[PDB]
Each structure stands twice: as structure tokens, then as C-alpha cells.
Amino acid sequence: GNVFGFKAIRSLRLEDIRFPVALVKTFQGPPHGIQVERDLLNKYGRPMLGCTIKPKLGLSAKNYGRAVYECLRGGLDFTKDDENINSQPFQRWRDRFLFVADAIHKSQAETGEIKGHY
Amino acid sequence: SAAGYKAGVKDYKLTYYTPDYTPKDTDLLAAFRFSPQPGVPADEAGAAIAAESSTGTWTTVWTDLLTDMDRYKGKCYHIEPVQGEENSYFAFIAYPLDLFEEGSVTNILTSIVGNVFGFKAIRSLRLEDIRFPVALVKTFQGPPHGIQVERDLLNKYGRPMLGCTIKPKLGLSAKNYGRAVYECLRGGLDFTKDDENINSQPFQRWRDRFLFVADAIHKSQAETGEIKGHYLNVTAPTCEEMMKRAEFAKELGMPIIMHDFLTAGFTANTTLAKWCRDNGVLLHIHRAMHAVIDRQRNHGIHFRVLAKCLRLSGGDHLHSGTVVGKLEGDKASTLGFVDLMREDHIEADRSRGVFFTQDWASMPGVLPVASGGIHVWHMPALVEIFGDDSVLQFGGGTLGHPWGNAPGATANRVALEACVQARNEGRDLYREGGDILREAGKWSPELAAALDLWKEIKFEFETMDKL
Amino acid sequence: SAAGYKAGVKDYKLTYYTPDYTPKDTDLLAAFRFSPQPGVPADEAGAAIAAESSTGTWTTVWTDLLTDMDRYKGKCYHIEPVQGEENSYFAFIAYPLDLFEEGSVTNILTSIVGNVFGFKAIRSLRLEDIRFPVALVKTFQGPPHGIQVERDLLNKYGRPMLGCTIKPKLGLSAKNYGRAVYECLRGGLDFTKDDENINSQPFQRWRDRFLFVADAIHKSQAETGEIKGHYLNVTAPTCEEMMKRAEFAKELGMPIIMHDFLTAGFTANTTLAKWCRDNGVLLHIHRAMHAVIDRQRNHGIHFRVLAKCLRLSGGDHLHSGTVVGKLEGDKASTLGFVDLMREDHIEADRSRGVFFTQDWASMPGVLPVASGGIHVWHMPALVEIFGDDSVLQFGGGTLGHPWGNAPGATANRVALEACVQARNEGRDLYREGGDILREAGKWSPELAAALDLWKEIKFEFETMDKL
Amino acid sequence: MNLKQIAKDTAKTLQSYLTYQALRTVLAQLGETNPPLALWLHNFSAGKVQDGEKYIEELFLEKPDLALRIMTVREHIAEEIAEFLPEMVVTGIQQANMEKRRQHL
């Protein structure tokens, strides 16, 4: 909170924290975690594959879903929004969600594998 | 047209270095200070920063040609070497208005500082300033109230306001907390506050503190005939808890709460700032964790960017540093971002660290709060630096008053009222502050005791050189 | 300083006529056309308009001196006589950004057109244009979807879309309404629509219509393999009823609803436009009542201001007139405000009635809807005037097809598809429209019957003058 | 300039060249000590000198003891010379460039 700006210290870097088990138990942690996720997605035996859609910004919702469909149909497990894709003039969020859902259904139907898009 | 898709890796600077670009008034501008890795030219490094914070990635993708890249791309339009320093440059980058979600500081930061700080080709990167275009500034609420509305709500005019953090930081029960609060407020302070890390803990649950503190505020206000407040900390694990705590403060009729905007985050903060506006509760903002980010000048984000972001997200107060106290604050820099958080129009001035002229289109100002390691001897300097529109806070400087709490409180309350009276009479607080304090110390023993304690190394050395 | 309070009546032009003022880019500009009463000078009349639509009243008040009037006052900065017309002038008035509530068309209109039109000293007043500053435009949502997102949702590319108002206006039961809808849609129209005054009435309650119309849409879409829609009118007595009706349309999975923005009002409309965005329903806007306001050029508000206001409040379609049909529309004017409702940047051009350059900062465009008294012979002119991004609507021009409804529908559906095919092939709809229609009439008897019926006065006269 | 990749690639090239240098040493030693064994190693190694770690695992498959001789020597050289290489390459490059910028530029 405050100690990094203390005049008497030139520089400060926190390297590690040991969280006591009694404190760890007050947290939920991952909603699912690794094994439950593999079980939900029927994905076993190797790393999963993803892909961020590009350009980072600038694509319309329909062109976004287009890129997603083509990626997923080709063998990737996931595609994803870029971190700075939220809701913007060129692409409002609810439109993207709509078109991306369509892309997921089409590619999953074609490949017979569970598909996702973050 | 769409100029043909040629797959493969190109230099970023072919697309993103645009030295002939003249920024539009709707562009968001950013000033970065960077050192490229050996062998990476400055213009390529600047272009890489522009690319990977807007539209670009490491290899050419065909999807660019589905849209109008010229309209959307970040544009590194100027690079200049940092005078006197080897391998250090300023890059100025323009981002189109279209890139940003309206009313979202979270989104703005995600682009500007999301990925580029970890780029292998760059040794260090520090964001110095952002010019927020007026068209974007207008998509934000800003302060729930701001300086003038706050003075009007509290009937507080004519001098800095005075606060105080209760100590020890952690360990006091709710009842002992309210006790310390009552004694501080009855002595002449306008505000007390929770420590930033006082949230809800085994030794003191939040709802108990809110209850006992409300009682202390009522008793002290009744005794003094002045409006009193205590920044009740609603900083919480989740949005739901945060709101639950804000709600009870309102139920108790509390005028002001506080929030740690960085450790809680901008998304929770923006929620709270909107609620405060709708519910008429003032919002004090603590900058806990900022120095993790803003201390070193080779890497990170300068505080003046964080201050600008907070004014957009929403806060009525924001800690600004003291310059003279226990925590670091460069004076020239501080005068710069105090102007950025208070004024409506701030001209570019590199001598105070203001890279861009900033307009706020009548978005209310934020009260700067000077806090940390300050005592009575600092008072004339603080009044000089910050002027009337500030809150000066004394935690140890109140509760650490040799005779205990109640005399400690009276020392601070007398010192404050003496300064407000003097200011109103036309005395210069900067030049005359020490004297004003000495004067009051003459008739206040408890102020005299405090002045003595924290006076502090004097020097004093010597004359010989006689003929 | 505050320059002394002298009570009493002064001329408005002493404070509000500022011919040396240069408008800022954040100023809202208004162009008024006015005729002063005999004896009232033009600059005083212009100043009175500026005064009483911003900060001023009829006599001097002391409260002015509590604030900074220079910052807040409306400023009549230019007056020019209307060429060729006695006692008629244009006043151009600048209003500070600070005067307006963000995101509120209601507030903007309340200032600009609230009281000044009834001023005794003015004979007539007509608001011609408003320049909305980009900083204000960004405080609005605008269209829930806009042109490109709508084409993408509906899979409709490459030509104007076709609609049709069901007739008679009132009197049909819900079942007979859906019957007429099914037969229209199955024949090739993209949309049908409720008449503007079809809300909920004894002969046809709204929820029954929504039910039967949804069935008609499903049957016709299944038969044709093209997306069909029907603008279900949610225009209602209260906000609550409006929302109840919008909600059921969503429940039925209806792609599009309609709203009479002027007779319901901007406050209800802005509510509906936000809901449409959050619920993914397209919003068609009917301009019922506009001609009460915008028809005469000496007094009222020109439609192009109403079109701008609607794009801000929110609508995916807006009726634009036909020029050639049963209701009035000046061509030059129409081309002007069609650009204002579609494009992102529109240069000032007085020959098309555009007084100010308008920027929209990437706010989506609104589809113009040409409707009213048009039939097949109008098609090439309509395609010429409006281009592909428009909806052309034929109510009587579909349901009035000599052989009845189903052939009437086929006539319209064939005429549309023939035009879309021709356009896509590179044929000029303006120059070749009549021919394209004649061609299709050769193999479509029902189109031929319609072309004959509504062809319409021909002229034709005579040669004598022989040697 | 992916600097850790370049350094990683540079170290592996230095390691392969130092393995070639060690192979030259061991070879010259066996020139005095064991002329046959020298002739075997000289013909075994011609063209094999590409990747130093692949060369070693392949020489271990044939003659584990001789592979060990090259292993020790490569490592002895490295411990003796590696600390002088930074200053030599940096000033080497600066001097070689300085020559050419002088005549040309």
C-alpha cells in the first residue's frame, strides 16, 4: 500500500508471499480449475490451442465472427477477443457476442469438437 | 485499395512510424519514455509501442484489409532523445478516438499500458502523460461533487481542511476506534479517516466501526458547532461487499467515505463514484499501491497519469503527496499534477512535467490531500504549496501529541484555526507560517509541546575570520 | 469585477450581440431565420433570441454577478439579411457546451426552441440548423445499431430494402392484419409495418396483433428463404406500456419494432433506443407530426434539425420523404439531410440547406425510409435519389395491386428483385429504372397490371410547321 | 533484437566451436601419444563437427573414453578463456567498424 514510496528507501520489490493455509481456505479460488475444465470440454491428452483475432481493433462484429469461424473450423480449440476489445464505436460488445456465438456453433458442428471463444 | 496480402514479418515502423502526422483534437496522445535494447533503432521501438497498443501484432495478417487501418492505427508521430541521457527517448503517439470505450478508464489503460511494457525489444518503458481529448472527457462523470460543491455541502470556506488517520493502523477495536475519532474531531479537525488497510478484520468488523464512528461524529459535531466527517473505508473483496458498506454509511447519514482505487481497481471505483453521485456521499480516494507503479523514472507510469485517470473515474479527494513528509514527492512535479487535478485548463509545461495541454471541459476538480509524516512545523510550507483548496492530514501528528490524545487533538485544532484566521486576515502562510504557529504556541501549551517535539535537525555552526 | 448592479431594463444587444465572437469547436451553433416586428432592429431581435434561449430575461437581475456571465451567455455572433426577401434575416448564435445536459435532446431543444418562438418582438422564427459539437455528440448513444450492423443482422446486401404499410390504416382485426402481412412478405417484400396510428384499439388490441404477425413472419420466411420483418408499433400512452410492448416483441423473437418519436416524445424515444441496444432489436422511427413543425419556411423547425436530433436520441430507420410521392419533400433539401443522417462528416452547403459542417465522430448512420404515395413507376427515381442504403415502402402500392393482395405483393416483390439484380449487374437505376421495370413486366403479368395502373398524366401534344 | 534468444544462440555456437577446438587439442595430443588413435579420430570427425553436443553423444556411442577426453578439454579451455571474450569481441567490433567508417564515411 504505502511502503514503496518511502523516502528512506530507494527501491523496493515484492518477490514472494507465503499465503498461510488458513487464509487460503477463505478464498473460492478458480471457478473450476484444470481437471474440471478438461472434463467440461472433453479435452484430454495434449495442450489446448487458442488464437487472438487480429487486427487488435478495427474489425466489425460480423468480420470478427468470420475470422473466428475460419480459425475454429481449422482445428483450434479456442479463439479470443483481444484484451482491449471491450465495446467501441467500430464494434459494440453485444453484436460481437451474437456473431461469435454463431461462428462457434457452425465450427463445432463441422468439426465434431467442442469450440470456445473467450 | 486493399493492397494485396503479403504474409510475413515486416518492421513496425513501416506502418506505425508517422513523423509527418499532425494530431487531431480528438486524438488521445501519449508520451512514453523508453530505452530500446541494443540493436533496436528508436523509431522501430517507438513504432512497436504504437503498434502493439492499438491494432498491430508481430506478423502481417490478412484481416487488416477488411477494414481501414489508416483510420484505426496508433501513430508514433514524434521521437526525441532525452537530453543528457544515453539510450533514452520520448515517443509521442496518437490514438484515434474510435479505439476507446466511452467512460472506461479500464479500457484506456488496457490499450496504452496493456502489453507494451513487457516487450523484449524494449529495456524499460514509462508512461509520462496522456492528453485526454475533450470529446472523450465528456463521456465520463468525473468527481461525484468536486471542490466547490464539497465546500458548499460542508460549509467549509476560507482555508485548507484538516484531517487525521487513526493509529495504530490495525489492532484497535471498533469502540476504541470511535473513541480516538471523537477526541480528534472535538479538538478542531474537520475529518478523521480509516487507515487504507482498515477494511473488515477479526479485531474490528466494518459494521461495528461504522456504528461507533457515527456516534463519535454526532457528539463532536454537537460540541463544536462545526460539520465533522470521517472517511469510512468501503474498500472490499467484491463489488457486492463494497456496495453493502457504502449503503450502510448512507443509512447512517455519513457525509463521506473512502476507497482505495488502485488495490480495488478502476472498475469498482467507477461503480462507487457513480453511486456517490446518486446518493450524495463524498468520496475520498486513497492511492495505495501507486508507488509500486510510479516511483522510478525509467519504468512504470507517472502519478500524474494516475491522477488524471482518477479524476475521470471519479473522486472528490485524492492524495497528492506532501513534498516535505515521510513519503516521496518532487515539488515541481507535484505543482504540475495538482494543477491537473484542480484546474480546467492546464498548459503544457515540461518544467513541471506536463507534456500536453489538458482541458477538462468543466469537469469538477479534485481536492488534493497532503498526508504522511507531517507535523506543525510543516504547516506554513503546506499552505504555501497547496493553498486553500487542499486537505492536510496529520495522523501521528495528532495522536502523537507527549501528553496524549486529547491535548494532541487540541494542538492540531488550534494550529489549524490559527492558520485559517491568519490566511483570512491576509497573512502569507508560506512566509509567515512558522510565526503564526509560534504566536499560537504562546497561549496554547499543548500546541507548544507539539511544536517542540516535531520541530526537525537544526542547524546551527558558526564567525572566526576576524581582522 | 462584478460590475455593479444597476436594476432596470437594458437592450439585449448590449450583452448578447457579439459580432466579433469566433465560435469554439465545443460551441453548439444555431441558425435561425427571423422577421422582427416593425421598429425592432435586427441586431436587437437576434440578441433577444440569444438571450432568452440561454441566460437572460427582460430586466437586469443582480444574480448575474454571482457567476461568470461571459462564460455562459448565448452569443449572437452574426446576422445576415435573407437575399431577396424583405425583413427576413439569419441569426447565427453560439451556445457554450456547459449549457446542455449530456445525452439529452430534450434539454437541448428546451433551450434552443423553448420560449423564443413566441416573443412579441418577433413576427416569425424558424430554426434552420444546429451544429452539434463532437464533444456533445459523444454523450449520446445514437442508433442502437445503424446501417452496417443492420445489413449484417438481416443478411441484406446489394440493394435498397422494401417495405409496406398495411391498409386500411385502422379497422382490421389482428388475424386479418397478419393475413395481409403474410401475403405481402411471401411475395418478396423485406418488411411490412403497422400504420403509425396502429397502437392498441378496440378493433385490434396490440398483443393479439403481435401474436398473429409473428406467425405471418415465420410462415413467409420459411417459404421464401429470406429474412422477413414487420415493424411492430410500440408507441404507447406511457413509458411503462411502451416497454411492456417492446418486451413482448423481444419475447416473440421479433427483429424490429417502430416508434413515433415526436408524438410519443424524445424522453420516451431515448429510453426505447437504449433498450433496443441492450436487447438487440432494430428500431424504425416514424416522423408523425413533423409537418406540423417543419413545413412552412417562415416559422417552425426544419426537418433536418429533427433528423439530427433523432440520430442522437436513437433510431435505426427514419422516414426521409420521397420527393415524388403524395407528401412534400424538396429534393435539394432532402439530399442534404439524407447526408446528415447517413454520413460521418457533412460539409456546409447552403444550396442543400446545410448551414454548418457536421461531424458525427463515428456515430452510426440512420437508414432513410422513402414512403408515401409511391408506386412502381417511381422506382428508378427513388433508387437514383437514395441509392442502396435506403428502405422504399409501398403501402397502397402493394395492397392496391387490380387483382388483389397476393398479385399486388408479387408485383412489388418482382419489381424489387429486378432492381436489385440490375443494380448488382452495374445498371444505372436512375437512368434505366423504367426500362428494368418494363423488362420485368414482360414476364410478370401482375407487375404489368400494376405498372399500368399507377403510371401517372402523360404527355403527349404535337409537328405542323412544315415548309 | 531478441537478446536472450541471440545470447542463447551465441553461447551454443561458442560451445560448438570450443568443442571443435578441444577436438583439435586432443587430436594434437594423440599425435604425440597415440598416432593410430589420432588417425581414427581425424577421419571419424571430418564433417561431423557441426553440432558439438550431437558430435559428443555420437562419439560416446563408439568410444566413451575419447568423448570424455574432448569433454574435459572443451571445458578446460572455456574456464581459461571465456572471461576475456567479452572485451575482445566488443573492442574487436568497435575497432573493425572504426576502420571502415574512417575510409568510407
From Swiss-Prot, chain A:
N6-carboxylysine sites (modified residues): K80
Protein name per the record: Ribulose bisphosphate carboxylase large chain
Entire protein: shown range: 119 to 236 of 472
Record comment regarding domains: Binding of RbcS probably induces a conformation change that displaces RbcX2 and triggers the final mature conformation.
Function comment: RuBisCO catalyzes two reactions: the carboxylation of D-ribulose 1,5-bisphosphate, the primary event in carbon dioxide fixation, as well as the oxidative fragmentation of the pentose substrate in the photorespiration process. Both reactions occur simultaneously and in competition at the same active site.
Mod. after translation: The disulfide bond which can form in the large chain dimeric partners within the hexadecamer appears to be associated with oxidative stress and protein turnover.
Subcellular location: Carboxysome
Binding site for Mg(2+): K80, D82, E83
Similarity comment text for this entry: Belongs to the RuBisCO large chain family. Type I subfamily.
Subunit structure: Heterohexadecamer of 8 large chains and 8 small chains; disulfide-linked. The disulfide link is formed within the large subunit homodimers. The exposed C-terminus binds in a cleft in the RbcX2 (shown with endogenous and Anabaena strain CA protein). RbcX2 is displaced by RbcS; as RbcX2 is removed RbcS mediates the ordering of an internal RbcL loop (Thr-64-Leu-70) in a catalytically active conformation.
Note: RuBisCO folding and assembly commences when the nascent large subunit folds with the help of the chaperonin GroEL-GroES. Monomers require chaperone RbcX2 to assemble into RbcL8 octamers yielding RbcL8-(RbcX2)8. RbcX2 is displaced by RbcS; as RbcX2 is removed RbcS mediates the ordering of an internal RbcL loop (Thr-64-Leu-70) in a catalytically active conformation. The basic functional RuBisCO is composed of a large chain homodimer in a 'head-to-tail' conformation. In form I RuBisCO this homodimer is arranged in a barrel-like tetramer with the small subunits forming a tetrameric 'cap' on each end of the 'barrel'.
Residues engaged in binding substrate: N2, T52, K56
Active site (record annotation): K54 (proton acceptor)
Swiss-Prot record, chain D:
Comment field on protein domains: The homodimer has 2 functional domains, a central cleft essential for production of soluble RbcL in which the RbcL peptide binds, and a polar surface which plays a role in correct RbcL subunit arrangement.
Segments traversing the membrane: none
One CC-aspect GO term: cytoplasm
Job of this protein: An RbcL-specific chaperone. The central cleft of the RbcX homodimer (RbcX2) binds the C-terminus of an RbcL monomer, stabilizing the C-terminus and probably preventing its reassociation with chaperonin GroEL-ES. At the same time the peripheral region of RbcX2 binds a second RbcL monomer, bridging the RbcL homodimers in the correct orientation. The RbcX2(2)-bound RbcL dimers then assemble into the RbcL8 core (RbcL8-(RbcX2)8). RbcS binding triggers the release of RbcX2.
Family label: Belongs to the RbcX family.
GO biological process, one term: carbon fixation
Subcellular location: Carboxysome; Cytoplasm
Quaternary structure, from the entry: Homodimer. Interacts with the exposed C-terminal peptide of RbcL ('Glu-459-Asp-468'); binds 1 RbcL peptide per homodimer. Contacts a second RbcL monomer via its peripheral polar surface. A slightly longer RbcL peptide binds to RbcX2 with a higher affinity.
Keywords: Bacterial microcompartment, Carbon dioxide fixation, Carboxysome, Chaperone, Cytoplasm, Photosynthesis
Effect of Q29A: No longer prevents RbcL-GroEL association
Species for this entry: Anabaena sp. (strain CA / ATCC 33047)
Induction: Transcribed in light but much less in the dark in both normal air and 1% CO(2); the nitrogen source has no effect on transcription. Constitutively expressed when grown on fructose. Part of the rbcL-rbcX-rbcS operon.
Full protein name: RuBisCO chaperone RbcX
